[PDB]
Amino acid sequence: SVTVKRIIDNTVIVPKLPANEDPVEYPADYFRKSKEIPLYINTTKSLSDLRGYVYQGLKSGNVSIIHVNSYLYGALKDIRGKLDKDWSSFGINIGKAGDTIGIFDLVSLKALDLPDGVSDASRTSADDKWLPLYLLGLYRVGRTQMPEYRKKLMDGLTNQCKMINEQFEPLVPEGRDIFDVWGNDSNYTKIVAAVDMFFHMFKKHECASFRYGTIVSRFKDCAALATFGHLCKITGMSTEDVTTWILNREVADEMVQMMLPGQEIDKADSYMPYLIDFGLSSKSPYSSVKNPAFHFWGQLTALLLRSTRARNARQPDDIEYTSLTTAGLLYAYAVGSSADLAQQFCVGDNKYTPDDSTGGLTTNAPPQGRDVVEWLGWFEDQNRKPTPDMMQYAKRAVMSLQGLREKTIGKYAKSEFDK
Amino acid sequence: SVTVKRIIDNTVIVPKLPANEDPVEYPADYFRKSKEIPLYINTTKSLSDLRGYVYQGLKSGNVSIIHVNSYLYGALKDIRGKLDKDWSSFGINIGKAGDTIGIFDLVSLKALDLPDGVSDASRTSADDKWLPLYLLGLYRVGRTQMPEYRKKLMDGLTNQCKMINEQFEPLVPEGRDIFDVWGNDSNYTKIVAAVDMFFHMFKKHECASFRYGTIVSRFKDCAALATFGHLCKITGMSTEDVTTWILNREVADEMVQMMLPGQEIDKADSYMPYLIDFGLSSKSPYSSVKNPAFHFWGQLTALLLRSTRARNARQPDDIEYTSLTTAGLLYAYAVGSSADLAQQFCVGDNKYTPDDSTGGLTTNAPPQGRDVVEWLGWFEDQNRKPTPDMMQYAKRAVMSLQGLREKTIGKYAKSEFDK
Amino acid sequence: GQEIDKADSYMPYLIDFGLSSKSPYSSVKNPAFHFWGQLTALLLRSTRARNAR
Amino acid sequence: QVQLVESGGGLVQAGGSLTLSCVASGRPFRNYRLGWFRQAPGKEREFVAAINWGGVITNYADSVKGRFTISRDDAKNTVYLQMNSLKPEETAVYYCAAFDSTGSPIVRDNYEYWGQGTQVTV
RNA sequence: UUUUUUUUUUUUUUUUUUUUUUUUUUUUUUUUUUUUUUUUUUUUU
């Protein structure tokens, strides 16, 4: 905020824009208020009643989410695992010593305070096997509006056909709209998140197949973090080294935003990956909506470094495409030229001995490592304009790309450097 | 106004043009007369009568806007929210202390001083759930005459299908003309504006989905302001810095016009974004009709700086395309060349140390920052004619643009620089 | 003295009101002005001039 | 919630004027209908007058047309009601009522809030 | 014998409309038409 005046008449002007809060909620700021997350559920009706409730309800268009929650409880209540080591997260010691932990030890059971429904018989305990797998799979199916990508219902149908050969989807085609509402019931999401969190620790459980459909709950609305992992993998550099190659102020603020020190983002098994479905946070701090310049920058740099995932990563709105693209060009060019090949194994204890008697002064050549302090200086020697070898390198990287979707950084990079 | 004479016979001529007032009405100039906005509504008939009134009226072509207003009132009357902090706008303290505020606390209720209509039974309170969502969605649907973009009725139909699985539009195809008149009833607009203004403060309400259809009321007829935000985002520069890069007199007058200091354009939750539907103003000051050169200039500069929204922004009529385009070319070229990459994080407390021993006099080179005072001087050294590197840069930016609509600044820029 | 600058005047309706049978401001009595101004506008990136006759 | 207090009652001479008032407390910044009712000794509560929120639409019982007048000042959140040319048939307890909406009903089942009432004897 | 604008008049002369608008923009979301159980030549002895 600095004073601005109109030079024709010395009139003072106050340039101001509309403001949008859109604050950010971290997971660990939820647990300092409540030391436990509740699961609202109805424990009145019996299991074999709920089986026909949700089977006959599934066959038709009418079904109560309260009945699929109350059915998923008792349908998954007697599933267990033995902890090899202790399990604690955000001050919640879920598992103590060698005692076995169930799938609902993670949350606390509360009572929901009713749907009349309709019942069915002849439904044995052989449907308790896959009906949870089904209802869990429709959460992953019912989150995508693409007509052919929603055909993951064929892979849920297949994964249950593996459990019982004569399994065919008990839902009408109009059902493409039936389970789309299930994702709005907080307790259903608190169920799928507990299922995925449970089966992440107990990996080779006989019912680990249930994780299909709930795997989309892990790190949901946390794309930018996964782009940081993808960049730290594609570049081959450490997290602290990649962190230095951030040359844009927005990516700096966002990188400071993701790396707050008390959110267990590094723990293997934690409540953090499920901060959205558990209700630990209503606005994730690790999304590509609150970290747009980081998503664009890291994804584009990866794409220039021969990435495959980035070919379909989406281009955010309202960011500095020019500065971000130049930064990704210098970074990807630095990593591209500096392969840093070094001998690793020797036979007769003979290693490569570099020759230091090269004194013809081979200057005006790019640096030898991947240090930012040297590539910024070389780039200054290039007048902060990308050299034709950099632009040609990027053209080499983005050309021969085919089948590119619109609004993706693959078509963006191709449309930017391939001409 | 300066004297003009015809040199052949010294005859005096008075060149004059037809005049059009088209004054500008600001929102805060409305509240110094009236300290409250009224909502004219009819409270005679009952709720369950209005439900069949507008359901059976919707199924046919005949419906009274008075009945959908009077129905939307009692259908939305018992919706509430708890204020975390105080809420006041233009001298109207809508919310006091911790007391809950309803959706019609914003306006004052007056009585409309009748349509005979026709009634219906069997319509329970399960239609009070989504009938407001429907009637609100048709305001957004009925503002566009494009055949496929008016198919947002599929997304209202979908958003209500989420509320009730068996929801299908109770309106005939000819209905594409039924809700187009609703936007002309001042009280209906005063309803949708109050709904959107309410649900902007209370963001995670269980009925926040109602905002769909009313979101088009926020900053309606206020495009130029959004182009100022889009430019201040794409450039990455501050509002006061971007304000200096205005080189055209018309854009100066318009920028002074938008930034009058008492219109709450910076408040998060205010009456300003709804100055049109609330009737606070009949001619908005922030529209791309009263700020054409600003819309064209900012949108074109954004497009040259790798924008996506600008590819379809429309080209206004009767403006100085030449001077505005040259200004946008110098601005976009300045922002494009001056990436201003600077080190942000360091490891061993080593930062980039620039070398000042460069004295070969690398003159005739563009400036190093984004200061207008230096780019105007460099541009003067270019004889106020865009250099071939500037025109080539713009060609690089506008080429590879496909699927461009007519009368848009995307096709304008492409047709201007791509040859 | 024809009030061509007044905001609300009888001048814009001099034809239907019968104030004048041959307008002085038509592109039939001012052809070279219409052609010259419209062409100059078109060269200055005009859109209306693209269809001016 | 809303509280209503009736004020202005009493005894008056047969043929004399009188003006009742009703003050509202709680949430006066919301749609709420305003009506006057009464109940005579051994007589069911009947409608007297009503006024809409804006203060334009009004209506009166047949037994009191011409004589009585209703009015409201929502700034001070009240509603006066002149009662000229009174008569011993006009003797009853008068109640102030509110029902939240944008109009004024003619029944007693349309209101939601009621005052305690003032006695009026003629 | 003609006549030799497949010119034509009466004004006129944006296949211009001003009512306000104007990304065939809505973002509540959230955005590899990724997904994990190994696996990872539409390899075989």
Side-chain angles (χ1 to χ4, degrees):
Chain A
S1 186
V2 59
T3 302
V4 175
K5 302 176 176 299
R6 189 181 180 184
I7 84 178
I8 179 62
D9 47 9
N10 262 267
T11 306
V12 191
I13 201 180
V14 189
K16 44 186 178 298
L17 279 175
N20 56 321
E21 275 189 23
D22 272 317
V24 152
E25 290 175 339
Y26 288 89
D29 300 8
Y30 159 85
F31 287 101
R32 81 178 61 177
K33 169 258 170 182
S34 179
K35 207 185 52 56
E36 189 43 86
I37 166 175
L39 207 171
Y40 293 143
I41 188 144
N42 190 279
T43 58
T44 49
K45 301 304 290 186
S46 74
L47 212 173
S48 194
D49 266 353
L50 292 154
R51 201 149 34 196
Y53 272 166
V54 310
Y55 192 100
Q56 269 309 316
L58 251 53
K59 293 298 299 175
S60 320
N62 66 320
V63 70
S64 183
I65 313 97
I66 298 100
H67 283 151
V68 309
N69 298 4
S70 308
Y71 166 64
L72 272 170
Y73 188 17
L76 294 170
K77 185 156 127 294
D78 300 3
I79 213 167
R80 298 265 178 68
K82 198 171 182 174
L83 284 174
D84 289 336
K85 265 304 171 183
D86 307 5
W87 193 358
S88 306
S89 181
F90 293 115
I92 306 186
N93 315 285
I94 36 178
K96 176 105 303 163
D99 320 348
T100 183
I101 56 167
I103 192 173
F104 291 108
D105 283 317
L106 318 168
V107 283
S108 57
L109 278 314
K110 265 63 190 174
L112 188 66
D113 47 354
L114 267 164
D116 301 347
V118 67
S119 179
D120 184 8
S122 73
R123 287 309 163 180
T124 58
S125 53
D127 302 355
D128 261 5
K129 280 297 181 60
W130 48 260
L131 247 184
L133 205 168
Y134 194 64
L135 300 157
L136 291 190
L138 291 324
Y139 167 78
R140 166 175 181 177
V141 177
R143 288 205 324 109
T144 66
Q145 315 298 82
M146 199 64 54
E148 73 273 38
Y149 186 63
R150 189 165 269 201
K151 274 195 175 188
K152 299 175 295 183
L153 199 145
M154 289 186 151
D155 191 67
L157 165 65
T158 307
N159 254 277
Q160 295 134 28
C161 278
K162 303 228 175 314
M163 201 105 78
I164 176 168
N165 169 40
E166 183 178 2
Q167 153 74 20
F168 271 76
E169 53 283 6
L171 201 33
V172 306
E174 293 177 350
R176 295 298 172 83
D177 313 308
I178 290 310
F179 36 89
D180 292 1
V181 195
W182 296 354
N184 276 65
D185 187 53
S186 165
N187 304 314
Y188 180 57
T189 63
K190 287 183 178 187
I191 287 172
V192 302
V195 176
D196 198 73
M197 181 175 183
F198 178 86
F199 283 110
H200 195 274
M201 170 63 81
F202 305 100
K203 178 187 171 308
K204 285 187 306 175
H205 182 62
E206 71 179 86
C207 305
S209 316
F210 288 52
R211 292 173 296 180
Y212 176 74
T214 60
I215 198 174
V216 296
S217 190
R218 189 167 184 82
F219 295 112
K220 166 182 169 185
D221 303 1
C222 301
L225 199 55
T227 75
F228 182 50
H230 181 60
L231 189 58
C232 288
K233 276 292 171 54
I234 291 294
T235 48
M237 312 165 60
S238 62
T239 68
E240 31 265 30
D241 275 9
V242 173
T243 310
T244 62
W245 268 101
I246 298 177
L247 315 167
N248 309 91
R249 294 183 181 277
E250 258 304 293
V251 192
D253 293 326
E254 300 160 27
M255 189 50 181
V256 174
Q257 189 186 53
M258 303 188 226
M259 292 301 160
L260 250 53
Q263 316 307 314
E264 291 189 12
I265 73 175
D266 62 303
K267 280 203 60 175
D269 309 303
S270 177
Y271 282 114
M272 170 269 172
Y274 315 95
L275 75 163
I276 294 296
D277 290 327
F278 271 156
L280 318 183
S281 178
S282 59
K283 170 70 76 169
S284 166
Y286 316 107
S287 51
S288 79
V289 180
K290 272 299 166 174
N291 305 135
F294 188 99
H295 189 86
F296 180 84
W297 167 79
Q299 280 310 120
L300 174 69
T301 315
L303 179 63
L304 261 43
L305 297 180
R306 307 309 186 277
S307 171
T308 53
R309 163 173 106 76
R311 302 173 65 260
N312 296 323
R314 309 215 76 92
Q315 172 187 345
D317 299 311
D318 295 19
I319 51 175
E320 332 166 50
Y321 301 103
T322 38
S323 324
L324 271 303
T325 37
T326 305
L329 213 174
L330 180 57
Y331 192 7
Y333 179 71
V335 181
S337 298
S338 308
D340 289 352
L341 314 183
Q343 185 165 349
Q344 305 289 319
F345 304 95
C346 59
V347 174
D349 206 301
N350 65 324
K351 336 180 197 308
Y352 169 55
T353 315
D355 201 347
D356 51 336
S357 73
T358 72
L361 200 82
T362 315
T363 45
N364 310 99
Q368 190 162 329
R370 293 171 175 179
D371 198 330
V372 195
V373 190
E374 304 181 345
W375 279 97
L376 286 183
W378 170 91
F379 193 54
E380 267 271 11
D381 289 345
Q382 314 304 324
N383 290 130
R384 277 153 275 93
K385 263 286 190 180
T387 72
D389 186 70
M390 299 173 44
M391 223 74 80
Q392 195 63 31
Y393 175 81
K395 181 190 181 189
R396 300 257 297 183
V398 304
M399 72 197 302
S400 68
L401 276 191
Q402 306 184 21
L404 296 165
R405 302 155 186 173
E406 294 278 346
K407 278 285 302 183
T408 55
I409 69 139
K411 185 187 179 54
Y412 173 83
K414 165 125 181 181
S415 298
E416 180 83 338
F417 303 105
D418 179 70
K419 40 185 166 51
Chain B
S1 186
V2 59
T3 302
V4 175
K5 302 176 176 300
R6 189 181 180 184
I7 84 178
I8 179 62
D9 47 9
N10 262 267
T11 306
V12 191
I13 201 180
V14 189
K16 44 186 178 298
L17 279 175
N20 56 321
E21 275 189 23
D22 271 317
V24 152
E25 290 175 339
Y26 288 89
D29 300 8
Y30 159 85
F31 287 101
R32 81 178 60 177
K33 169 258 170 182
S34 179
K35 207 185 52 56
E36 189 43 86
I37 166 175
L39 207 171
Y40 293 143
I41 188 144
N42 190 279
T43 58
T44 49
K45 301 304 290 186
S46 74
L47 212 173
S48 194
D49 266 353
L50 292 154
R51 201 149 34 196
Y53 272 166
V54 310
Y55 191 100
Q56 269 309 316
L58 251 53
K59 293 298 299 175
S60 320
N62 66 320
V63 70
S64 183
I65 313 97
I66 298 101
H67 283 151
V68 309
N69 298 4
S70 308
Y71 166 64
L72 272 170
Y73 188 17
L76 294 170
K77 184 156 127 294
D78 300 4
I79 213 167
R80 298 265 178 68
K82 198 171 182 174
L83 284 174
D84 289 336
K85 265 304 171 183
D86 307 5
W87 193 358
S88 306
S89 181
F90 293 115
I92 306 186
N93 315 285
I94 36 178
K96 175 105 303 163
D99 320 348
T100 183
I101 56 167
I103 192 173
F104 291 108
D105 283 317
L106 318 168
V107 283
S108 57
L109 279 314
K110 265 63 190 174
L112 188 66
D113 47 354
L114 267 164
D116 301 347
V118 67
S119 179
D120 184 8
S122 73
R123 287 309 163 180
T124 58
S125 53
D127 303 355
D128 260 5
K129 280 297 181 60
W130 48 260
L131 247 184
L133 205 168
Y134 194 64
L135 300 157
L136 291 190
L138 291 324
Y139 167 78
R140 166 175 181 177
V141 177
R143 289 205 324 109
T144 66
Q145 315 298 82
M146 199 64 54
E148 73 273 38
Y149 186 63
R150 189 165 269 201
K151 274 195 175 188
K152 299 175 295 183
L153 199 145
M154 289 186 151
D155 190 67
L157 165 65
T158 308
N159 254 277
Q160 295 134 28
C161 278
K162 303 228 175 314
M163 201 105 78
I164 176 168
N165 169 40
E166 183 178 2
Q167 153 74 20
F168 271 76
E169 53 283 6
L171 201 32
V172 306
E174 293 177 350
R176 295 298 172 83
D177 313 308
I178 289 310
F179 36 89
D180 292 1
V181 195
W182 296 354
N184 276 65
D185 187 53
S186 165
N187 304 314
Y188 180 57
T189 63
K190 287 183 178 186
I191 287 172
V192 302
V195 176
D196 198 73
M197 181 175 183
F198 178 86
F199 283 110
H200 195 274
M201 171 63 81
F202 306 100
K203 178 187 171 308
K204 285 187 306 175
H205 182 62
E206 71 179 86
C207 305
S209 316
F210 288 52
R211 292 173 296 180
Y212 176 74
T214 60
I215 198 174
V216 296
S217 190
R218 189 167 184 82
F219 295 112
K220 166 182 169 185
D221 303 2
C222 301
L225 199 55
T227 75
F228 182 50
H230 181 60
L231 189 59
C232 288
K233 276 292 171 54
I234 291 294
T235 48
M237 311 165 60
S238 62
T239 68
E240 31 265 30
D241 275 9
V242 173
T243 310
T244 62
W245 268 101
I246 298 177
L247 315 167
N248 309 91
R249 294 183 181 277
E250 258 304 293
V251 192
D253 293 326
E254 300 160 27
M255 189 50 181
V256 174
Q257 189 186 53
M258 303 188 226
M259 292 301 160
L260 250 53
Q263 316 307 314
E264 291 189 12
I265 73 175
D266 63 302
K267 280 203 60 175
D269 309 303
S270 177
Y271 282 114
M272 170 269 172
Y274 315 95
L275 75 163
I276 294 296
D277 289 327
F278 271 156
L280 318 183
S281 178
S282 59
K283 170 70 76 169
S284 166
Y286 315 107
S287 51
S288 80
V289 180
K290 272 299 166 174
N291 305 135
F294 188 99
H295 189 86
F296 180 84
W297 167 79
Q299 280 310 120
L300 174 69
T301 315
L303 179 63
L304 261 43
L305 297 180
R306 307 309 186 277
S307 171
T308 54
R309 163 173 106 76
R311 302 173 65 261
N312 296 323
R314 309 215 76 92
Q315 172 187 345
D317 299 311
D318 295 19
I319 51 175
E320 332 166 50
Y321 301 103
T322 38
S323 324
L324 271 303
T325 37
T326 305
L329 213 174
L330 180 57
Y331 192 7
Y333 179 71
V335 181
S337 298
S338 308
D340 289 352
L341 314 183
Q343 185 165 349
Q344 305 289 319
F345 304 95
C346 59
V347 174
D349 206 301
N350 65 324
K351 337 180 197 308
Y352 169 55
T353 315
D355 201 347
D356 51 336
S357 73
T358 72
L361 200 82
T362 315
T363 45
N364 310 99
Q368 190 162 329
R370 293 171 175 179
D371 198 330
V372 195
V373 190
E374 304 181 345
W375 278 97
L376 286 183
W378 170 91
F379 193 54
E380 267 271 11
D381 289 345
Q382 315 304 324
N383 290 130
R384 277 153 275 93
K385 263 286 190 180
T387 72
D389 186 70
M390 299 173 44
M391 223 74 80
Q392 195 63 31
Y393 175 81
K395 181 190 181 189
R396 300 257 297 183
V398 304
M399 72 197 302
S400 68
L401 276 191
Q402 306 184 21
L404 296 165
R405 302 155 186 173
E406 294 278 346
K407 278 285 302 183
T408 55
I409 69 139
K411 185 187 179 54
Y412 173 83
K414 165 125 181 181
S415 298
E416 180 83 338
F417 303 105
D418 179 70
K419 40 185 166 51
Chain C
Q2 316 307 314
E3 291 189 12
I4 73 175
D5 62 302
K6 280 203 60 175
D8 309 303
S9 177
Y10 282 114
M11 170 269 172
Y13 315 95
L14 75 163
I15 294 296
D16 290 327
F17 271 156
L19 318 183
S20 178
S21 59
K22 170 70 76 169
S23 166
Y25 316 107
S26 51
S27 79
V28 180
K29 272 299 166 174
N30 306 135
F33 188 99
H34 189 86
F35 180 84
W36 167 79
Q38 280 310 120
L39 174 69
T40 315
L42 179 63
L43 261 43
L44 297 180
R45 307 309 186 277
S46 171
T47 53
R48 163 173 106 76
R50 302 173 65 261
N51 296 323
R53 309 215 76 92
Chain D
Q1 279 206 54
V2 168
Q3 296 85 0
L4 312 162
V5 176
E6 299 96 345
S7 171
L11 275 66
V12 176
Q13 65 279 26
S17 174
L18 176 136
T19 189
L20 299 177
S21 64
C22 167
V23 64
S25 310
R27 175 223 255 145
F29 329 94
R30 181 177 65 83
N31 70 328
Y32 63 89
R33 291 193 297 274
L34 285 194
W36 284 94
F37 287 80
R38 73 186 179 187
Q39 187 183 11
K43 178 196 118 312
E44 293 177 350
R45 191 160 317 179
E46 76 187 18
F47 174 77
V48 173
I51 182 159
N52 62 347
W53 178 255
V56 160
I57 297 308
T58 59
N59 188 340
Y60 293 85
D62 293 333
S63 59
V64 308
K65 300 301 290 187
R67 303 188 300 176
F68 298 3
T69 308
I70 192 167
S71 43
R72 56 186 293 174
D73 193 321
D74 61 356
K76 61 180 68 180
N77 282 318
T78 65
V79 175
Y80 317 77
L81 177 63
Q82 290 281 168
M83 297 171 57
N84 309 342
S85 305
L86 286 178
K87 63 177 172 61
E89 297 75 9
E90 297 302 320
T91 297
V93 175
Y94 286 66
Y95 304 84
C96 179
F99 176 80
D100 71 314
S101 192
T102 59
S104 61
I106 58 109
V107 175
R108 181 177 65 83
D109 268 351
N110 67 67
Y111 292 114
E112 293 177 350
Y113 296 137
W114 294 82
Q116 298 308 305
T118 321
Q119 177 77 46
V120 171
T121 320
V122 190

